[PDB]
RNA sequence: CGGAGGAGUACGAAGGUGCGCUCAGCGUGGUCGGAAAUCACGCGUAGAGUAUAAAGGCAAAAGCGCGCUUAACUGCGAGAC
RNA sequence: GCUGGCGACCAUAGCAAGAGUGAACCACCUGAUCCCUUCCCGAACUCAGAAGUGAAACCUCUUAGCGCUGAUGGUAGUGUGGGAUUACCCAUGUGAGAGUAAGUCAUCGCCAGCU
């Protein structure tokens, strides 16, 4: 016979792109992700498709806050 | 009731019960008279009759009851109305109460059919009453088929003692 | 024949068989039960044989507690075929065995006719046994 | 009274996955001790006495003395840690009474 | 509850003033007293606060529309006097109407834009 | 030619904005309505929902309703995947 | 010392049980004239005053009944070199999860008011 399996997607290519520590420009990408794993903090932008992006020149720095004990990423100028 | 209710009710009642601060004695907060029209779909004009009739008996124009979901063993679903409820309180509720004890319960065929049992146990008292008639409107005639309604009376008494005793007080006959 | 009553997915990976086991090596429903040593995979007709042997020299006065349950389904491909187009089906379950499992425990008989019985058991089963007993600590 | 058993001391070059299994090779099991008004003693103990005195049911109930040096402490067996398949002790907690 | 209805409804235009990092004019009203206050940014310091305890307008009714129309007239000076310019009106869930809206004329005719 | 499922659409509102509201499940009494039809209170809790398969998400709800509307614009565009 | 508002963290901070305050604040409470509100109801939104109370609710004090935090030691796993091949042993580096002892009724800033 035959097997009704063996189709697959195309990658996406997702996950962090810019590090904690790390140096930014406005206007870099620093989060592909699907939906909010994580939230935007001070000078940091969120687009259509959940991506995260910097809107101000400085340092990343990721954390851990709220009640609800969700990840934010934000920039420090 | 309307006054007589302030001025005395209360009073008796506190010297009944024994209750230590003037803010325990039990109050009817509200009633609300509900019916639904099953099978609405099979006509769509019996609700038509039915929110007339019951703007008739109580002047508070209704709002008619969607329903959620979809059964399927009945022809139910979400998006058409299939009954109607009105909730009464303050002066309103008042006169309806009037009205009640006055002429309703002599038209009832049978009197001291209501039950002291079947409170809700938290001090609300749920009542159906059957048929459109017995109460003050036009004759059969110019009226739709015979129609039930239920009459829920919530009240803020703590327990079904509380409860009795305040329809005691007020005069409901069973 | 044990066979789960429903399955998510029909046929599993073949997966990879090591480690100890940590769970499941404590006498906790009886008094005398026997623990395999080393480590393989056991048949549910293999189960039902060893259950059969140990009721039938018990002769029914006791109760035996089974412990270990085939949930792992095994595909063969049919014969004659050549390697190729697709997975192969189903023809029967099994359970993975890890040193020190506990495999059967007898509560209400003799420890004389427990061992004994599980003597006759052991020779039917494909991996060495031992006897243990329940104990405080 | 019932039970003395005799520990050494094992110090940090004796704590460790390495130096445990060397000692169990060397037919020792560590144990650690943990108890008020003291912080946690590690210990070492042999198989033989530890084996001889699982056997005995009283073991469990009644107080155990343990003796390193001229230091004993009086505690009482809290958990035992025991082989999957080959059953030996392996290791041993006790709390002071 | 009540409150906790009013709190849920506000939360969103507090964390919108929060985000857009503006001069904050919050408001709180009671049936008896009506009480502002303005707040910078970071939300740590109060710059200028407004009410109807205080001595001037303590002896009147405290619980109406010219009482808020006096505070608002108070905190719009204090604004002044402290050097905020620009800010951002928080009705804190209360419907903008009322007492509330003629607290925040009183505060636009003082000088405060928003 | 490994194991499992979907797609070749839909919507001038199912878009925009201001405002307002939280699901579903059970325990008690009530009409021809009962396992399951409308309605009051109370308990525990997100298992509801999100046009469609699954995954990642969703309280400032991204879930639900109302009024007004066409940013379902034109010229571009630092910077980054 | 007590109350209200705005902030920093989100259970060592919560749930549950017991107890207390109104002189000021808070809440309930009166009425539907005026502004405004109900797919019907001043029930909610909103306006005018204060007749009464701390009943409900907010706030504050005790605990350990839940919930939560949580060692030491050992065990599993694992990078590099060597040995062996049912998946393990040695040298060195690293090191959980669960469980145990133990702990837990939080804490810190700005503004206004009262005895």
């Known amino acids: 016979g035959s097997t009704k399996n063996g189709r697959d997607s195309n990658p996406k290519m997702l996950g962090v792109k810019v590090y904690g520590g790390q140096t930014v420009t406005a206007g870099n990408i620093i989060v592909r992700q699907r939906g909010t794993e994580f939230h935007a903090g001070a000078n940091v932008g969120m687009g259509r498709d959940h991506t995260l992006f910097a809107t101000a020149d400085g340092v990343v720095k990721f954390e851990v806050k709220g009640q609800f004990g969700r990840r934010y990423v934000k920039v420090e100028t | 009731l309307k006054a007589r209710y302030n001025d005395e009710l209360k ?59 979809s059964i399927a063993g009945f022809k139910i679903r979400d998006g058409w109305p ?55 409107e036009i004759d059969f005639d110019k009226i739709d088929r015979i129609r039930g309604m239920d009459i829920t009376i919530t009240t803020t008494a703590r327990t079904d003692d509380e409860g009795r005793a305040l329809m005691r007080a007020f005069g409901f006959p069973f | 024949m044990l066979q789960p009553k429903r399955t998510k997915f029909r046929k599993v990976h073949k997966g990879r068989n090591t480690g100890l086991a940590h769970r ?114 | 009274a019932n039970f003395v058993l005799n520990a050494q001391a094992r110090a940090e070059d004796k704590q460790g996955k390495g130096a ?75 709390k002071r009474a | 509850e009540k409150k906790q209805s009013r709190l849920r409804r506000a939360k969103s235009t507090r964390l919108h003033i929060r985000a857009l990092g503006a001069t904050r004019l919050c408001v709180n009203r009671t049936p008896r007293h009506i009480y502002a206050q303005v707040i910078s940014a970071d939300g740590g310091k109060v710059l200028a606060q407004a009410s109807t305890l205080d001595a001037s307008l303590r002896s009147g009714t405290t619980g109406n529309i010219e009482a808020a129309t006096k505070v608002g007239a108070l905190i719009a000076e204090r604004a002044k006097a402290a050097g905020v310019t620009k800010v951002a009106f928080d009705r804190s869930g209360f419907k903008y109407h009322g007492r509330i809206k003629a607290l925040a004329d009183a505060a636009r005719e003082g000088g405060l834009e928003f």
């Not at chain 2, 639904?36 to 209704?62: E, F, S």
């Not at chain 2, 109607?84 to 309703?104: N, P, W």
């Not at chain 3, 697709?86 to 008989?109: A, M, Q, R, S």
């Open chain 2, 11 to 69: 009073a008796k009642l506190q010297e009944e019960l024994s209750i230590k601060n003037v803010m325990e004695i039990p109050r009817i907060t509200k009633i609300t008279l509900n019916m639904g029209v099953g099978a609405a779909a099979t006509d769509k004009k019996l609700l038509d009759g039915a929110v007339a009739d019951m703007q008739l008996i109580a002047g508070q124009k209704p709002v008619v009851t969607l329903a959620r979901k």
């Open chain 2, 82 to 136: 299939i009954g109607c409820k009105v909730t009464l309180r303050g002066d309103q509720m008042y006169e309806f109460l009037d009205r009640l004890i006055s002429i309703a319960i002599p038209r009832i065929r049978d009197f001291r059919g209501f039950s002291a049992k079947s409170f809700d146990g938290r001090g609300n008292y749920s009542m159906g009453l059957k048929e459109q008639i017995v109460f003050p």
């Open chain 3, 24 to 137: 499941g090596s404590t006498v906790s429903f009886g008094s005398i039960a026997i623990k395999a040593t080393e480590r393989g995979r056991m048949t549910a007709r293999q189960i039902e044989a060893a259950r059969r042997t140990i009721s039938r020299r018990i002769k029914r006065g006791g109760k035996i507690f089974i412990r270990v349950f085939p949930d792992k389904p095994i595909t063969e491909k049919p014969l004659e075929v050549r390697m190729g187009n697709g997975k192969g089906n189903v023809e029967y379950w099994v359970c993975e065995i890890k040193p020190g499992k506990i495999l059967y425990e007898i509560e209400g008989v003799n420890e004389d006719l427990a061992r004994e019985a599980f003597a006759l058991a052991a020779a039917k089963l494909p991996f060495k046994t031992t006897i243990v007993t329940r104990t405080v600590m």
């Open chain 4, 20 to 94: 445990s299994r060397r000692l169990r090779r060397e037919s020792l099991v560590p144990a650690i001790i943990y108890g008020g008004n003291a912080e946690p003693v590690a210990v070492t103990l042999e198989l033989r006495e530890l084996v001889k005195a699982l056997e005995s049911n009283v073991f469990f109930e009644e107080v155990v003395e343990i003796k390193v040096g001229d230091k004993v402490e009086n505690v009482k067996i809290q958990a035992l840690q025991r082989h999957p398949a080959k059953n030996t002790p392996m290791h041993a907690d006790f």
